[PDB]
Paper text:
While the INO80 architecture appears similar to that in the INO80-nucleosome structures, a major difference is that it is rotated ~180° on a hexasome compared to a nucleosome. We find that INO80 binds hexasomes and nucleosomes in opposite orientations, with Ino80 binding near SHL-2 on hexasomes and near −6/−7 on nucleosomes. We observe that Ino80ATPase engages the hexasome predominantly near SHL −2. All Ino80ATPase locations on hexasomes are different than on nucleosomes, which are near SHL-6 or SHL-7 (12-14). However, the Ino80 orientation on hexasomes is consistent with structures of other major chromatin remodelers on nucleosomes such as S. cerevisiae ISW1 (25-27), Chd1 (28-30), RSC, Snf2 (34) and in particular the SWR1 complex, which is from the same sub-family as the INO80 complex. In contrast, a gap at SHL-6 did not inhibit INO80’s sliding activity on hexasomes, but a gap at SHL-2 slowed hexasomes sliding by ~ 2000-fold. However, sliding hexasomes is less flanking DNA dependent.
Unlike other chromatin remodelers, INO80 preferentially mobilizes hexasomes, which can form during transcription. Here, we report cryogenic-electron microscopy (cryo-EM) structures of endogenously purified S. cerevisiae INO80 bound to a hexasome and a nucleosome. We group subunits of the INO80 complex into four modules: Rvb module (Rvb1/Rvb2), Arp8 module (Arp8/Arp4/Actin/Ies4 and Taf14), Ino80 module (Ino80/Ies2) and Arp5 module (Arp5/Ies6). The Ino80 protein consists of three major regions: the N-terminal domain (NTD), the HSA region (Ino80HSA) and the ATPase domain (Ino80ATPase).
Author numbering:
A (entry chain A): 61 to 135
B (entry chain C): 16 to 120
C (entry chain D): 29 to 123
D (entry chain B): 24 to 95
E (entry chain E): 39 to 136
F (entry chain F): 25 to 103
The structure:
DNA sequence: GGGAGTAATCCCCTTGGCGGTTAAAACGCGGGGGACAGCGCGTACGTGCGTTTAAGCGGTGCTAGAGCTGTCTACGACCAATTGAGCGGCCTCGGCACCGGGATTCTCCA
DNA sequence: TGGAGAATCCCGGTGCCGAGGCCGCTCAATTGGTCGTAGACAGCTCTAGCACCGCTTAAACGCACGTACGCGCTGTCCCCCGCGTTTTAACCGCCAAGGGGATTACTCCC
């Protein structure tokens, strides 16, 4: 694991507070959430790496991230 | 008498019940489910026909062509999100020229 | 000739109920029919899987409401939920 | 409140380093927190919907599993 | 002899082909292409005309979406010309090529 | 081969609908290849559903289900 | 007693072809604006060091709420009767594409 | 910078063919009743989740600093566009063979 467990479960509790009050969570639920988020960001950073190497650079810019999410199909 | 008038809709409810029964989605099917589903389909039809009529009035037409449906679905954000992975035959593409390609003289 | 079921007269009723002075072509008829059949299949399949996931054998109004909540984005989902609840309530309260 | 800063600079650095990124700017962080927030907003609402329709007050792991299968 | 500057006719053609809606690839070469591809899988298969029209529509949609993605990838590389590396990048980001 | 029927100005017009100003000459062969791959997958799925459903003639609704298998759904051809 | 094998059929649609012709791709060239290569700088980024903070581990207490059994009752499968909404055949007259003359509007270059 | 000039918009006449009513059936939707059980509800148990606390130690914050490359500028050269000209294949209109999947009848077996 890369992201620490307690900040990520604090974040998922804070974002689930906005949709239903007094919501309780299982521990394997937040572990699966952490694993899915890390897999998403690793795949994203690989795509932005190809975007950065395309434009003759080794430093990644945010415009690489908007290029990756635009070409990938998201908004 | 008929249950579409009883619910207060225009879409059929018995046809929706028969199509839910045929498709084997579950072993049992309730009574309020085709009423709710016909209401949902009628309301989605209400936005798309509203926005298509707005497009046709913009383009000075009285009959809706599929180009006006394409323009209506690709302009509203929620309808473009719901119908993102579809395509409309004889539709065309929204006008979008990127700014850096303009003749900046 | 065989009988083919379409939704053309009902969407023509909806179109004349909203914009009273507007026509429609047969091609646009075909795309609009395809839209309503596809959203029928999508909401129906989502409701079917929610029926299966809770060890339940019946499709009710709750399953269709949850399917509209999952499958439709934005305020369009909330307004469709309101329309469905109003139609179901006046159907049940009818004599 | 303001707990999006828990996704810190070296954690983002390791997430890029597993992906093979060599050099990272300073404006990368303020965009990747936004992308992670958007992804979590799109998952947790489906998890909440599944938990509410089953008439439960606890989000189980299985609800998360079907929530992720929603997006594919 | 009057001559327009290089670049204006591209703007005119982009506007004229974004305003219109009629199909671009001619019918009979695409018919020959789909029959030749179907020759490889099974033999003596026959097509409806509506099937061929649907394949034309799907090909148009896929290629215009691919070219829009290629154009965005080309602008990101600080150029105007599209190049095959832009197409390869656009297909690698989607995941169509492993 | 009939892949040469997809001519140079047809890909030019496909570029112009997508909003392309300047085109290199090496685009065209790659475009022919990617359209070949796409059509090969689609007709494979269509003949699969037709051979399972047992007719000699492939109909448009079968390739609509083939496109719906790929998540590239089409409206307006009986779908 | 009813589903199904076999066959004749009236077609309905598919594929192939043949000549006109005419838009449309193919080609060639002039030439010019962008792709590409190289240099300068200065600015931002990796690395390292010292410190400060909080994550994780253990330990426990309370109690909400998932999970399951018992029972029944209102609700949905299911069947006979019937009947009007919704399908298809068909007639038309208007909506909209097309063509042309002219006004309008960008654009080039001297 | 203003005239040339070509591309675009715009309104009047043309016509054509297709959307939309109208008529007439017919068959699945509606009424009514019957029965069997799915889930609505009650209630019991006791797993798992939330929280309070402390302690140790790895991880991050912060700052200095050297320098690697991001980007702006300039030269070059080349290949791609605009347009004139030449050949060619899509299309069109119709015809003809002819195969093909649904439509009746004739007849058979568990």
């Amino acid at each position: 694991l890369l992201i620490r467990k307690l900040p990520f479960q604090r974040l998922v509790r804070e974002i689930a507070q906005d949709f239903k009050t007094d919501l309780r969570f299982q521990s394997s639920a937040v572990m699966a959430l952490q694993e899915a988020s890390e897999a998403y960001l690793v795949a994203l950073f690989e795509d932005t790496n190809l975007a950065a190497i395309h434009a003759k650079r080794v430093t990644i810019m945010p415009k690489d991230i908007q290029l990756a999410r635009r070409i990938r199909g998201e908004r | 008498k008929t249950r579409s008038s009883r619910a207060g809709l225009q879409f059929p409810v018995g046809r929706v019940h028969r199509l839910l029964r045929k498709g084997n989605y579950a072993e049992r099917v309730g009574a309020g489910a085709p009423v709710y589903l016909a209401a949902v389909l009628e309301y989605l039809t209400a936005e798309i026909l509203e926005l298509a009529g707005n497009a046709a009035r913009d383009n000075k037409k009285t009959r809706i062509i599929p180009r006006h449906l394409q323009l209506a679905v690709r302009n509203d954000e929620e309808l473009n999100k719901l119908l993102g992975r579809v395509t409309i035959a004889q539709g065309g593409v929204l006008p979008n020229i990127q700014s850096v390609l303009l003749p900046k003289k | 000739k065989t009988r083919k079921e379409s939704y053309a007269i009902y969407v023509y009723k909806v179109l004349k109920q909203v914009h009273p002075d507007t026509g429609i072509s047969s091609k646009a008829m075909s795309i609009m029919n395809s839209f309503v059949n596809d959203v029928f299949e999508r909401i129906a399949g989502e409701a079917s899987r929610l029926a299966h996931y809770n060890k339940r054998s019946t499709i009710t109004s709750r399953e269709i409401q949850t399917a509209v909540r999952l499958l439709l984005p934005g305020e369009l989902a909330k307004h469709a939920v309101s329309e469905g609840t109003k139609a179901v309530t006046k159907y049940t309260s009818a004599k | 409140r303001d707990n999006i800063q828990g996704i810190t600079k070296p954690a983002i650095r390791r997430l890029a380093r597993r992906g093979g990124v060599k050099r990272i700017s300073g404006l990368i962080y303020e965009e990747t927190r936004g992308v992670l927030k958007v992804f979590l907003e799109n998952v947790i609402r489906d998890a909440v919907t599944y938990t509410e329709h089953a008439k439960r007050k606890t989000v189980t792991a299985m609800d998360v599993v079907y929530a992720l299968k929603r997006q594919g | 002899p009057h001559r327009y500057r290089p670049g204006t006719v591209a703007l005119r053609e982009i506007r004229r082909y974004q305003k219109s809606t009629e199909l671009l690839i001619r019918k009979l070469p695409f018919q020959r292409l789909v029959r030749e591809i179907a020759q490889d899988f099974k033999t003596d298969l026959r097509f409806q005309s509506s099937a061929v029209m649907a394949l034309q529509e799907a090909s148009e949609a896929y290629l215009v979406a691919l070219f829009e993605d290629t154009n965005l990838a080309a602008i990101h590389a600080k150029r105007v010309t599209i190049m095959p590396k832009d197409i390869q990048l656009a297909r690698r980001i989607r995941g169509e090529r492993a």
